[PDB]
Design a protein around this ligand. Sequence first.
Ligand SMILES: Nc1ncnc2c1ncn2[C@@H]1O[C@H](C[C@@H](N)CC[C@H](N)C(=O)O)[C@@H](O)[C@H]1O
Ligand SMILES: Nc1ncnc2c1ncn2[C@@H]1O[C@H](C[C@@H](N)CC[C@H](N)C(=O)O)[C@@H](O)[C@H]1O
Lengths: 331, 333
Amino acid sequence: RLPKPMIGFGVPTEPLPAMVRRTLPEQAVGPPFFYYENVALAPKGVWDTISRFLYDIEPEFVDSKYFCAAARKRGYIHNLPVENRFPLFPLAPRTIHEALPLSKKWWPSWDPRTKLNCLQTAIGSAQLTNRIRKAVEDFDGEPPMRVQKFVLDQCRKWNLVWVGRNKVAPLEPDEVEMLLGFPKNHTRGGGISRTDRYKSLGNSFQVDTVAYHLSVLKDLFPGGINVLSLFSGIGGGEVALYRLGIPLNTVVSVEKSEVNRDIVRSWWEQTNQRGNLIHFNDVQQLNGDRLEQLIESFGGFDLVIGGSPESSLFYDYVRILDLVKSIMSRH
Amino acid sequence: IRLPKPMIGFGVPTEPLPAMVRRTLPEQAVGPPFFYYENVALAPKGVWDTISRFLYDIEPEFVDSKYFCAAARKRGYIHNLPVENRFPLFPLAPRTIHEALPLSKKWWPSWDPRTKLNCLQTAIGSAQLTNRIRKAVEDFDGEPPMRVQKFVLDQCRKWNLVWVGRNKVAPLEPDEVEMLLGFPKNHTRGGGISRTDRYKSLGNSFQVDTVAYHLSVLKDLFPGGINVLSLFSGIGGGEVALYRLGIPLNTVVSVEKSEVNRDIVRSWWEQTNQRGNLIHFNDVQQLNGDRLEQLIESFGGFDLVIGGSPCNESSLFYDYVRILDLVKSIMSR
Ligand SMILES: Nc1ncnc2c1ncn2[C@@H]1O[C@H](C[C@@H](N)CC[C@H](N)C(=O)O)[C@@H](O)[C@H]1O
Ligand SMILES: Nc1ncnc2c1ncn2[C@@H]1O[C@H](C[C@@H](N)CC[C@H](N)C(=O)O)[C@@H](O)[C@H]1O
């Protein structure tokens, strides 16, 4: 199934695994590079399917805990050079202590969490926190694993952290934004509600992880790149490239969520990007006719990137990848 | 749907549309290889939008087989073939019930106005139903109330029942079905193949005369024969069409899950005494870039990729699009 340590072809912080290199089908190679992500713990044959349609390339499984304080198991399918990768600096917090310095005066002896579980879209009610306190207000103890494993399992699933005496709380949006490697208040703005923030963050790249894989693009494109981002979310791929110091000449972003679109746009404006951000609402309108003239106007895409959301939407990733890949092959 | 009426596609032998050619295709769509994909005309909502989307936004050719034979059959064909200089397949299939069934005339009630059959199903009328219908008209001098006329007509239209005796209706025989679809006689007949198995594999096969009219433009294009990649090959409707068109089949890679269908095509292959090779796979899934490359390396590359819809699995269509993209990518080097 999945590997010893989910370190893919290697992580900066750890000793290399046995297989450090790959050879890949000459269909897979050539312009453009592509990068697809999906949840690692997937149902049967799902990864078989994804692989079959992506040139039978073997997916790279890495846990993002090797890059930050939050664990997150993903598979990545790409034709990127695996050699000469480098980690993204400024370096992200590796532990809860580093990520949340003030949380450690309140941290019980029996909570061994040095890493956070996967960050997700919904969040523990005020009730749960009040309840947990009630459970452990009996003090002087370490009270039995009934109470402990209850609290620990609840803290694990909701990512609850100690912020007071016998008191837990969900991660604030900007604590989440930082564990995922986004700018502070990246998702904050306009009409965006609190729960909208959490939802957008729940489904998004861990920027530090993604940056490590995309780092090999920097030496390859000193003049900048054109990016086609499918299912852009809150711009995780584009932020990784910007933090990597790779100029974004042109970016075509396909993104159905309005909130997600505002977030990316504001980011493009706040960072004072000088390239073009071109947006489309639905992936189903990137037809050949359009792609033809995008590529004609702004040159070919050097990278097409996307993550998994509708389960048939994956086939549109495949459909757009090769439309692009075919158009960019004309002798 | 956005279904045209009359449904004559890009032309039919009786209205071949000279002076009309198909508009220039997107550079992505144009061959080689030529591709040809079939699906039922009355698909559910959005299906054809999707199919067209994934095949270079090409407009499907909607055509009723009633313009080619005696049994109506509404299908959509999406392809990158030239339309100009098509020609009808000969020998010519029967256009009406009377021509298809010369001996049915003597038993045909004056009030049964059918001259054409309905879409050939995979399933068939029950001996009770016929028994009933016969029984139901044991009244003298026929012409009984419309209410009974309307009943039997509806049932005859539903199950494609034909008159075979005095007050006697019967389902079409397998070999009568094979005829209407344009296959050789007893094409599906073979050792061990059940009667029910025959009717089934037939009920969802290409109408050969219709398909041949579309593929006819390939004859002048490939005097030295073609290599064919046939996905969801069934009982070999696409191959039978090309053979009957007089186009030599040098290399055919047929992919078919059913063994009954496999044996039928193989039987045809050697009874026809074909010279070229027929290679069988059973899952589209086992057709990957590696294999496709070694296949093209061995046999020279495909001039035609042909496939029929296996569903109204629904995901199998994406395997067709996948395979088409690989083949197309490989040859383009
Ligand atoms: N049907 C669709 N059409 C276009 N975009 C979509 C569709 N479904 C989801 N998306 C986008 O793809 C994203 C889904 C996520 N799996 C991707 C997250 C993204 N990688 C990020 O960095 O946040 C959402 O942010 C949506 O904006
Ligand atoms: N997943 C699959 N892989 C390979 N073959 C299949 C699969 N599903 C269905 N088939 C075969 O493909 C056919 C699907 C039909 N729509 C095609 C009919 C065929 N084109 C004909 O002319 O009669 C069936 O007869 C099946 O035997």
